[PDB]
Design an enzyme around this catalytic site. Sequence first.
Site, PDB file in Angstrom:
ATOM      1  N   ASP A   1       0.871  -1.165   0.000  1.00 38.68           N
ATOM      2  CA  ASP A   1       0.000   0.000   0.000  1.00 38.68           C
ATOM      3  C   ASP A   1       0.910   1.216   0.000  1.00 38.68           C
ATOM      4  O   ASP A   1       2.137   1.103   0.027  1.00 38.68           O
ATOM      5  CB  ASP A   1      -0.997  -0.040   1.179  1.00 38.68           C
TER       6      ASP A   1
ATOM      7  N   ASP B   1       1.180   5.036   2.044  1.00 34.94           N
ATOM      8  CA  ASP B   1       0.738   5.754   3.240  1.00 34.94           C
ATOM      9  C   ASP B   1       1.130   7.219   3.133  1.00 34.94           C
ATOM     10  O   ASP B   1       2.306   7.529   2.906  1.00 34.94           O
ATOM     11  CB  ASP B   1       1.352   5.140   4.501  1.00 34.94           C
TER      12      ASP B   1
ATOM     13  N   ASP C   1      -3.559   4.760   2.166  1.00 39.54           N
ATOM     14  CA  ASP C   1      -4.024   5.309   3.435  1.00 39.54           C
ATOM     15  C   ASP C   1      -3.711   6.794   3.488  1.00 39.54           C
ATOM     16  O   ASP C   1      -2.584   7.208   3.197  1.00 39.54           O
ATOM     17  CB  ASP C   1      -3.384   4.596   4.625  1.00 39.54           C
TER      18      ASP C   1
END
Length: 328
Positions: free
Chosen positions: A194, A196, A252
Site C-alpha cells: 500500500d 501511506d 491510506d
Amino acid sequence: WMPAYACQRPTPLTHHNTGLSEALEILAEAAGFEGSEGRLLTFCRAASVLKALPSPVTTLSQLQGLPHFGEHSSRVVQELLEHGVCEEVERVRRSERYQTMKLFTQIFGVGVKTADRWYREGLRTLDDLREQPQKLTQQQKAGLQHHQDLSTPVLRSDVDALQQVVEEAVGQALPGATVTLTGGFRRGKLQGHDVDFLITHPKEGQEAGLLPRVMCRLQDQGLILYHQHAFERSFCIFRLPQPGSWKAVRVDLVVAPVSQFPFALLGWTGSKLFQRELRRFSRKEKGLWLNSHGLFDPEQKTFFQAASEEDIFRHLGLEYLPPEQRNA
DNA sequence: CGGCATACG
DNA sequence: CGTAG
DNA sequence: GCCG
Ligand SMILES: [Cl-]
Ligand SMILES: [Mg+2]
Ligand SMILES: [Mg+2]
Ligand code: NA
C-alpha cells in the site's frame, strides 16, 4: 551488547540472517492465527534480533546471551543451521489451517476473528466466499473484488504518481496543506502492499475538517474505487494508471495537526514492531505514555511538545534512528 | 506470576 | 468487528 | 515464548 527493545538498536531493511528471520516470522504469524499474541510477540522479537545482527549466525553458540532466544526459538535456529529446514516450520507451512487463515486474513476487511469463523464453517477458498456474498460486508466485497490487484506489489514509480494526484486534491481542499510519504517507502522499501500519506498544515487548526474535503475531490476525479464514506484516517482503494489500463492500489490518508505531526510521522513510518516496542519502552522504562498523537507524562499530567522525530527520541532517552533503521 | 501498544472507522 | 503503523 |  544486543539491547532488549527493538527501538534501542538499528534494524536495516536488508540484513545477514534473512532465512532464519523468515522462519521465526512464520511461527509468529501462525501464533497470531491461533490468538496467541504473547507467542507472536516473542517470535517477532527473536526474528527482529537477528535482523539487527552485523553478520550471519553460523553456530548455535552465537545465540547465547541474545534477548528473546530461549529453548523454542533456539531449537528452530539449530535445525535450520544443521539441516537447512525446521520441521515445525514446514509443518505450519503445509497445514490447511495456516494456508487458509493466511489467504483469508490478507483480504481487506477480514481479520483473524472473521477468517477463523469462516474456517470453522468449512470455507477454504476465495470462490467459496464469492458464492455467499450477502454474508459479506461492503468492505469485504471490495477487498474480494480487488484482491488480485491488491496482491501485486506497489512500486516506487507508482508512489510518485499517486503522491502527485493526492497533492493536487489536497491543494484545492486547503491551500498550503502538505503531503508526506510515510509507511514502508519512507523506511526505504522499493516495493509495498500500500501507500501511506500524512497530511498536515503549518497553521494549527487549519487541518480540521480536511480529510472529507480531500476525499470528495479525489472521488470526483474518478480516482477512488472504494472508501468508507468527521474523520482523520481514510483506508482507500485508488485507481492507478498502468500501460493501456489501470490497477487497484491500497492508499491510506491520515490528517494530523502540525503540533502532533512528529508523533503521527513516527507512528505511521513504523515498522509495526518498532512502534509497539517504542511504546512499551516509553511506558515500562520511562513511565511515559506514547501514541501517534503525543507523549504524556502521567505524573505531571502534561504532554511533551515535539517539533521533530529527533525531539521524541530525545524525550525518551533513546539514540536517534532514521526511518531506514526502524525496520524491526 | 503478569505482561505483552495504542489508537481510529 | 474492521483498519493503521 | 520469553523477560523481569
Ligand atoms: Cl500466547
Ligand atoms: Mg504501507
Ligand atoms: Mg497502510
Ligand atoms: Na485483512
